[PDB]
Enzyme design. Structure first.
Site, PDB file in Angstrom:
ATOM      1  N   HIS A  12      42.709  33.695 113.236  1.00 16.10           N
ATOM      2  CA  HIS A  12      44.023  34.129 112.819  1.00 16.10           C
ATOM      3  C   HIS A  12      44.032  35.640 112.458  1.00 16.10           C
ATOM      4  O   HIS A  12      45.088  36.185 112.120  1.00 16.10           O
ATOM      5  CB  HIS A  12      44.568  33.177 111.704  1.00 16.10           C
ATOM      6  CG  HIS A  12      43.965  33.338 110.329  1.00 16.10           C
ATOM      7  ND1 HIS A  12      44.173  34.469 109.578  1.00 16.10           N
ATOM      8  CD2 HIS A  12      43.242  32.500 109.536  1.00 16.10           C
ATOM      9  CE1 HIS A  12      43.588  34.348 108.401  1.00 16.10           C
ATOM     10  NE2 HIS A  12      43.013  33.167 108.343  1.00 16.10           N
ATOM     11  N   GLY A  60      43.045  38.703 101.547  1.00 14.89           N
ATOM     12  CA  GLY A  60      42.073  39.477 102.271  1.00 14.89           C
ATOM     13  C   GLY A  60      40.653  38.971 102.164  1.00 14.89           C
ATOM     14  O   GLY A  60      39.746  39.607 102.692  1.00 14.89           O
ATOM     15  N   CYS A  94      39.649  36.236 103.533  1.00 16.98           N
ATOM     16  CA  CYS A  94      39.368  35.411 104.698  1.00 16.98           C
ATOM     17  C   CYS A  94      38.228  36.040 105.485  1.00 16.98           C
ATOM     18  O   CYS A  94      38.200  37.252 105.686  1.00 16.98           O
ATOM     19  CB  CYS A  94      40.613  35.280 105.596  1.00 16.98           C
ATOM     20  SG  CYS A  94      42.242  34.693 104.836  1.00 16.98           S
TER      21      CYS A  94
HETATM   22 ZN    ZN Z   1      43.667  34.932 106.685  1.00 19.18          ZN
END
Ligand code: ZN
Ligand code: ZN
Lengths: 306, 306
Positions: free
Chosen positions: A41, A143, A145
């Protein structure tokens, strides 16, 4: 002496973390050999999140675009593959800091360390458990991720987790490093549904042995039983059932303390209906289930060999 | 979201740790520039521990002896000084991995990370608080002496602690990096005496704001007061007194949440006599005092800039 929820030292992982940017968006990534691994993503635009068609989102995506940074050096992405829910990029330079790494898909109840990262740099390290419903109760803000979870039992780094979602309920979900989600979840910013989160019985018992080792006796009472009467209580209180497989795993701690697994179940039985609850064990008023029998041995004794 | 007791990433410290040996004995040490720092009882022989005369123990000690190791490289000690309770050695090679470091003598209540090491190698990392009686409730077994505590707020490493003793009571004591013990303790394996350990009020309040930020409201009640009625309860329950200096420190979290410091004291008042105690806050049934107001800001928000 002492007992602490300790994490693995993170040095070997810190040198693997990069700041990845695509379309716009930017998140964390994992540079091993010369490949960057990150959540897919990364390529998603906002409205995209709510209903993404990754195959179509990406077939467009510029190669020669995904922008990757690392202190004072930015990696020139060549090119790109999507494995399940991660993207792998075969960038221009190879991480001289790739250590002996492997990949693992751990199973619910196992523990690992998480290096939380923002804008590609280290922020903190903590020790956490994969819940039986395959979530983690973590600490992640915008942020984070792409932050990973790992072990370095010895010879370093078994990567086991990469962060993707914060569920609407406040819990965290992610994948193994080949992009296979843990649990019933997708990378869609939509309604989900995690299991009932149950307590990890085998870990609670390991923690009781760690307590005895550290001077906690008060809860060892003069009862006992076999493990159908236990299991028949341990699940009204929603503890996962104990198997002979868990019993074998506790043996060494039994041999350490001279306390039979079954007799420890007995006090755990009573603790559920009378004992715990404010006189604390190892300074806590709840029963803790984020230590494996292996974490207790490593720490508390078996701390030499990597 | 989430809230975890997280440690600083340890990478920059891992490359500073060595295995130090003298007479016989062997423990951990800290290699910066080209000097090794370690506990002075490294030179102590067994019966020595019970009653050491360090000046006499050491005036004998062979220079050209203290043996220092580091993976596959052993440092040729030249020579040697004793600063208070540490030894400094001016060895043959300088640590290319010395980062921006400084030294700090933190004050009771501040938090730091500890890298626990055995035989000079990393074992684990955990986040801990210096108690008001200047002890730490830690996790250290045989051979962990010389492990250090540190911060890397930004630009790296404020070394603040070096482990020396396990007290007969099970708590841990040590020095700053110039060898000045924290608290009333010596490096003698003899009878001691630590204060009464009181709860760090300002940290508990920071933790309550972190909870509100993370969806914990239940304990915000419709009372309040000023801080002589609080302080007059907070110390029957042996909490250190709250000062206007602590109030100023909490301001930003007050501005974050729209909750006045004084109103938060009110629910803390009641929590002492009614509230806490099993419905948990941030998943704990006790009030936790190992987060500073600064740890709450860093984590939970202020996590970008190193
Ligand atoms: Zn993400
Ligand atoms: Zn020692």
């Amino acid at each position: 002496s002492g007992f602490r929820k300790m994490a693995f030292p993170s040095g070997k992982v810190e040198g693997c973390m990069v700041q990845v940017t695509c379309g716009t968006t930017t998140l964390n990534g994992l540079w091993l050999d010369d490949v960057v691994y990150c959540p897919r993503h990364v390529i998603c635009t906002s409205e995209d999140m709510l209903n993404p068609n990754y195959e179509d989102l990406l077939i467009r995506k510029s190669n020669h675009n995904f922008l990757v940074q690392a202190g004072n050096v930015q990696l020139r992405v060549i090119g790109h593959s999507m494995q399940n829910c991660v993207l792998k990029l075969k960038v221009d330079t190879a991480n001289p800091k790739t250590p002996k790494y492997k990949f693992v898909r751990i199973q619910p109840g196992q523990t690992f360390s998480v290096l939380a990262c923002y804008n590609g740099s280290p922020s903190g390290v903590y020790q956490c458990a994969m819940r039986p419903n395959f979530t983690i109760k973590g600490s992640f803000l915008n942020g984070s991720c792409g932050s990973v979870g790992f072990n370095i039992d010895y010879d370093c780094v078994s990567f086991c987790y990469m962060h993707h979602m914060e569920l609407p309920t406040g819990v965290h979900a992610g994948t193994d490093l080949e992009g296979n989600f843990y649990g019933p979840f997708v990378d869609r910013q939509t309604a989900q549904a995690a299991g009932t989160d149950t307590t990890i019985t085998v870990n609670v018992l390991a923690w009781l042995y760690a307590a005895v080792i550290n001077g906690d006796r008060w809860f060892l009472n003069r009862f006992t039983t076999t493990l159908n009467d236990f299991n028949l209580v341990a699940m009204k209180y929603n503890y996962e059932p104990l198997t002979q497989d868990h019993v074998d795993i506790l043996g060494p701690l039994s041999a350490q303390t001279g306390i039979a697994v079954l007799d420890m179940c007995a006090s755990l039985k009573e603790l559920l209906q009378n004992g715990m609850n404010g006189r604390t064990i190892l300074g806590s008023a709840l029963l803790e289930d984020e230590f494996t029998p292996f974490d207790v041995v490593r720490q508390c004794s078996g701390v030499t060999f990597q």
